[PDB]
Amino acid sequence: ALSLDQRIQTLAYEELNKAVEYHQAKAGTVVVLDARTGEILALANTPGRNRAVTDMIEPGAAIKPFVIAKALDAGKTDLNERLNTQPYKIGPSPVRDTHVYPSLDVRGIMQKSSNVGTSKLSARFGAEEMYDFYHELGIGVRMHSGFPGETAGLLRNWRRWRPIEQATMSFGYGLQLSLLQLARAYTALTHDGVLLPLSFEKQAVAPQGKRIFKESTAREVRNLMVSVTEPGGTGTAGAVDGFDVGAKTGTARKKHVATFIGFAPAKNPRVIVAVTIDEPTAHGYYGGVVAGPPFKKIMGGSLNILGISPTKPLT
């Protein structure tokens, strides 16, 4: 039997098309996964190819949680350390955030989506170590979904990386993956450190995946990601009434691609929703403002369809 849940598929399709029309965008995609099994509950595309599977995108800020998790897991940082997060250059090439934060702890780096902080954490590992880590997340590794024209993605050989390139990859530029690959990676955070394979068929038990992070690390990171959707984070547009939502929002230059990805309930996740809107031309272009609202409606609605009870009182 197919894992597709038609109630969620129809919701996803409805909310995607609305957002695409309202922002006058070229295209968009939604992926909804069962966060404990990897089953694909919904896969929605605007007319044309199955972009969720075929189109490789730069993940942008959506990759940062993994870099943070890896630094914590390897003991290269902790939740007390305060990093200098002033903008800097490596030779001619700058690394900067949206604002100048003189210093941030790891929670702050997640909350404010600090390119600087994330890049410094990545720089505590060798290029080869980071390369293997990205390959372990499935980047550059075809999923063999069954759809023709499927993308493998892009992960350059570590021996060819400049120091600036390692930094830019850590905040999601210079490597590429499909939205389905990116949604898959998020199972490593939701399923307590264990990356799941993904399926188009129903699974009566969670498949055997593979461990990327310690369980403690994944739990800590999910808690950090809730800061993204609360006041003071970049992703308040994707807050869902009644729930704590862990999320990341992203905006990549190609013209932009606006991305919002997250899971709920954050502590014991049931659903991953990933939304990408390609080239919005009206009413903003950032991931929070463009992809946040459809994420909010798709996540809130999925949680209701699936019968998950709110964990905090509704407002």
d(CA 129, CA 143): 22
Is-cis flag, bond preceding 265, omega within 30?
yes
Strand boundaries in 79-166, DSSP class E: 82-84, 88-90, 93-95, 103-105
Strand partners of residue 278: 27, 257
Structure-derived torsion over alpha carbons of residues 251, 257, 263, 264, reported in degrees to the nearest 10? 90
Domains and CATH numbers, the chain: 1-315 (3.40.710.10)
For residue 134, what is the enclosing H or E element? helix 127-136
For residue 27, what is the enclosing H or E element? strand 27-34
Residue 94, Cβ density class (10 Å: 0-12 exposed, 13-18 middle, ≥19 buried): exposed
Strand partners of residue 88: 95
Three-state SS string over 35-64 comes to CCCCEEEEEEECCCCCHHHHCCECCHHHHH
Angstrom distances, CA of residue 118 to CA of 130, 144, 209: 13, 31, 27
What is the chain's Cα-based Rg?
18
Contact call for residues 134 and 67 (beta carbons, < 8 A):
no
| Resolution, angstroms, 1 dp | 1.7
Structure tokens at 125: 């590992």
d(CA 260, CA 199): 22
Q: How was this structure determined?
A: X-ray
Structure tokens at 25: 């965008």
- Give the N- to C-terminal CA distance of the chain in Å, as an integer: 38
Residue 284, Cβ density class (10 Å: 0-12 exposed, 13-18 middle, ≥19 buried): middle
